[model samples]
Target: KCDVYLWGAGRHGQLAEAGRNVMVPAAAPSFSQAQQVICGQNCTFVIQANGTVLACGEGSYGRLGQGNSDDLHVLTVISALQGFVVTQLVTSCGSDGHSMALTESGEVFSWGDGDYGKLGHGNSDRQRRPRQIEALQGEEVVQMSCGFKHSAVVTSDGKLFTFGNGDYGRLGLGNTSNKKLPERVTALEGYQIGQVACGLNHTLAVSADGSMVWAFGDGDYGKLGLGNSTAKSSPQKIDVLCGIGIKKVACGTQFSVALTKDGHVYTFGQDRLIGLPEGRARNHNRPQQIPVLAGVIIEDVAVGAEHTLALASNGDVYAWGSNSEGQLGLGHTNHVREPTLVTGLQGKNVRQISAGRCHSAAWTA
Candidate 1:
């Protein structure tokens, strides 16, 4: 049992009690028995074991779900959700300024900008309060994730569904057509999906058998890992990487990276983000195993707006790509063309890593 805390910019009153320019400690001493934590562009929320929720930060878009769009810093409880007893909480953000959440009962909710149906409510209207996404009623949604302007959900029965912007086939529906509502990805019906991750304009999924990795949409920079610059509208399995024993996968704006059970790392897509050996900057259409990460055993991989992060079994963190926003956690805003070990986090064992549009968060043990 541990307490929940918010650490970062509190300009919007996301910290403890709404003070101007006040930086809250990374660890909050007030919260106790917390089970999960979720961070959005400017707001953060926590879910406790007893099904209660606490939130703070920017509420201009009603992201705090407190019935108004006012910034907050104290731990505010969502009155409407008081007795619901949520089982799970998932969140995602978009540039148009919107947010979404999926509860354990297969209920989907959205609030904020809906100009392109990123909210999946079948309409392009901004919602100031959490509204039930009726379109996902019978989907049995087990997991959900959001990209910059798109969203995806996986069913317990191994089905995939997507909606929102699909200009580059990010929806994986076998076309560049954008959908304003949730559409089932009929292309990958029979395959057992172990996990799924969405990027700015692409998506990645690992098969149930853990034998292959599948990708689609926006392959121009080799983010598809297929070794070519051509874009794919439908899902395509990377057969060349069949024997690597991949365990996890992540996608960035225009790049793809994967981690294997043996602690090996592989990358393809835009060379600017992948960081090939010999200091070469080139794009690959096909998936190429990263030679620089050969000896280190990578336990987890995370892709940010234009950067990448990998955590090793030995408690070291490595970062690469665009660092304009300090998302690389290298203590500077310099872009790293190769896998650079993150300073100050050398001895801390990282248990989980997540990438936001331009920021990142990690749980250390």
Candidate 2:
């Protein structure tokens, strides 16, 4: 009843069974009824409507959730969660190596590299298997994500919880300090976040109404969208988008992208246009429209370590930026300077898109 397609950097053997780079969109034979694709630098996790999560790829820092730091050449079940029904799963790796899972009962589980208490186990102890974050007890975690070494969650009641490394004040705790457990974000207690995205060491949250965006943490590239390049220990609204009516946002290693209610796409932070002329050294500290996508109405967008992907309203997927590893699904490793259609899914209606450290994946019925 479903199909999940993958492409891009395969040095980690994440794209195909033979451990090769899938230059074009290809189905993961082991997956069906797939709900979403979560990408990590050297790993991939698939979710199912039945509340199951499957994963495979390089086992760096035990990111595979197999109860050991060993590479898995094939999709394998997470030892700690065997037979458990899960509601959501998220994978993050780059400056931090970790994975997160949410159960329908609103329980939160974390595993993998525990540096800076990223595993949320109340201490920096590497977890070979999933472990519950005791501090989040009785909290209904609705949605969650992770940054370099920090994490955040939203409850059904619209509250936000954050923890882990507080460097640059990314935790929104009004001070810089790492936490070994979960803690509610006092600054955003009244915002009622509906969606959230994480960057290298920063965070972004969308209000329950989806009209307001709050950001905090390392603002070096102005990734926080707070007007200036200054670190914030508390959440602040992105004034420029006060009236833009943002619906969704994606954050990369050093850049960020947003989707407006009217279908326009805005990009900001360290802009590294791969094939764009004179853009090799370009960087925007504020939000700026992609210009070419002016007349194009997009539905959702995904960002990678160095690329951007957008799903057009017309049922086509357009990609640009770094394609050195074929993450753009263009069938080649050449970087793209302009938005190009993904010819592989010529007539397929791609419903969702996700990009990782150096790869991309899509879902279609």
Decoy 1 TM-score against native? 0.84
What ranges in model 1 sit over 4 Å off? 1-34, 85-89, 278-280
**Candidate whose TM-score is highest:** 2
- In model 2, state the lDDT of residue 354: 83
Which residues of candidate 2, in runs, are more than 4 Å off?
Answer: 273-283
Q: Measured by TM-score, how close is model 2 to the native structure?
A: 0.93
What are the root-mean-square deviations of the candidates from the true structure over C-alphas? 3.5, 2.3
Best by lDDT: 2
What lDDT tens digits, residue by residue, belong to model 2 across residues 1-365?
A: 67678888777677646336777877766655668778886788877777778787778777887888887767776757866788788777476478889998888889888999767888998887888888888888888887778888888888888878888988888999998887788887766788788878888888877778888888877677665689888888887776778898777776677789889887767645422234522536667777667778999888777788888888788888888778888889887876788998777778888888788888874
TM-score on alpha carbons, each prediction: 0.84, 0.93
lDDT by residue (133-161, candidate 1, tens digit) is: 78888777777777777878777777788
